[PDB]
Amino acid sequence: AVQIGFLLFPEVQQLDLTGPHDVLASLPDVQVHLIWKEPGPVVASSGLVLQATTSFADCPPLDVICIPGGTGVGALMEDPQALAFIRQQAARARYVTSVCTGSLVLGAAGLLQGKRATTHWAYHELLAPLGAIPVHERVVRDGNLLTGTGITAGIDFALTLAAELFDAATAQRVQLQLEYAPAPPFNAGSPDTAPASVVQQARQRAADSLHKRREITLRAAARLAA
Amino acid sequence: AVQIGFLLFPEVQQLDLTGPHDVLASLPDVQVHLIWKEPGPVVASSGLVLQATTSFADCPPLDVICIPGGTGVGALMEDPQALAFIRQQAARARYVTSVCTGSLVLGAAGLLQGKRATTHWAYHELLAPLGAIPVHERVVRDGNLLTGTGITAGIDFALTLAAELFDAATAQRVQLQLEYAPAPPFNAGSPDTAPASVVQQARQRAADSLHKRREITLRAAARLAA
DSSP states (O other), rough: EEEEEEEEEEOOHHHHHHHHHHHHTTTTTTEEEEESSSSSEEOTTTOOOEEEEEEEEOOOSSSEEEEEESSTHHTTTHHHHHHHHHHHHHHOOOOEEETTTTHHHHHTTTTTTTTTEEOOOOGGGTTTTTTEOOOSSSSETTTEEEEOOOTTTTHHHHHHHHHHHHHHHHHHHHHHTTTTTOOSSOOOOOOOTTTTHHHHHHHHHHHHHHHHHHHHHHHHHHHHOO | OOOEEEETTOOOOOHHHHHHHHTTTSSEEEEEEEEEESSSSEEEETTEEEEEOOOOOTTTOSEEEEESSSSHHHHHHOOOOHHHHHHHHHHHEEEEEETTTTTHHHHHTTTTTTOEEOOOGGGGGGGGGTTTTTOSSSSEEEEEEEOOTTTTTHHHHHHHHHEEEEEEEHHHHHHHHHTOOOOOOOSSTTTSOOHHHHHHHHHHHHOOOOOOHHHHHHHHHHHHHH
């Protein structure tokens, strides 16, 4: 059975996780894990309560690891237990993936040094201090690393993983079974397509978070420099 | 505060719910409820464990009700307690919505009689016996009823609801904050675009479920005829 694991942490953006989870859980001969320090309840940033299924110590060797984003990324960037677990699993995983600000956690773990990567548009400036080559594209691959942008990036790249782990016909069948054919009613999903007034509102609302994450990123970079 | 409720039932397709939940929970002055017979754990079809927040009896009057789909729809189509709750809330709700096979539950409740509606492509034949005018479109509106197809229909129609409850600029800001700009790597999300061989595989895998749901639908239609 292909072993797929998601890191589930307090103040996760749950859709970053729950999207790819439902797609990948649709595949034959896949076991999906929700990993935290111990099994039990974990609260997402919206208040949705999820349930971790395994501890770090009990998690099997993973074929795919996926790091979601969210508010809670700041704490995770300075959690030595979580970062050590991610490094251990990344060493042997066939695919190391992240959604949105989850790539900042891969960065703090040292896994973006010299690698092309993306992250959420409002936090993109934090990639270079973590050793990455920043790329402004929705899905960036560098060897076995996939980083994606957008709360639903993992749905799209889960179909790519399905095609490579199995075959294109399997990926197409899952897409059809889920009738997955998005059609957003607005075109404001990028700072390059949204109205300038909307980009200003969004930047202003992110400013306090970006300020705090600049501080965290510099401490995380100092640990990589040691 | 705008009151938004999702029905959370055993063997729900969790992404049908968790997608629109994370979008709508991003809006100011919104309270989101996960409704079942009692608060507590509810297991999705994938094994993901979610947590209902309120009972039928304790749920406030809702401005928006949303019925997700999933395996578990068959039981819900003959659950008199659930159907009565949906009818009570639909009477005063500003919006009555469903994702995928959730429209079959609205059908069993009598809320599609004489109404244009859609559902999942493999089950579309079950709309007419429930009194609907079947429509092969991804989002179908008829007055205050919205029915959508695709596991992520609720993400897209949540942006429409945001624009009507608030304004277009608010919907655009949420889209940008979430960097929501999907780009599926395959074009097999409709039986009209998927390869014929893939459509056959998907139809064959749905055949046992469709057979059982034909039987349930006829009993649900008999109750509406009384």
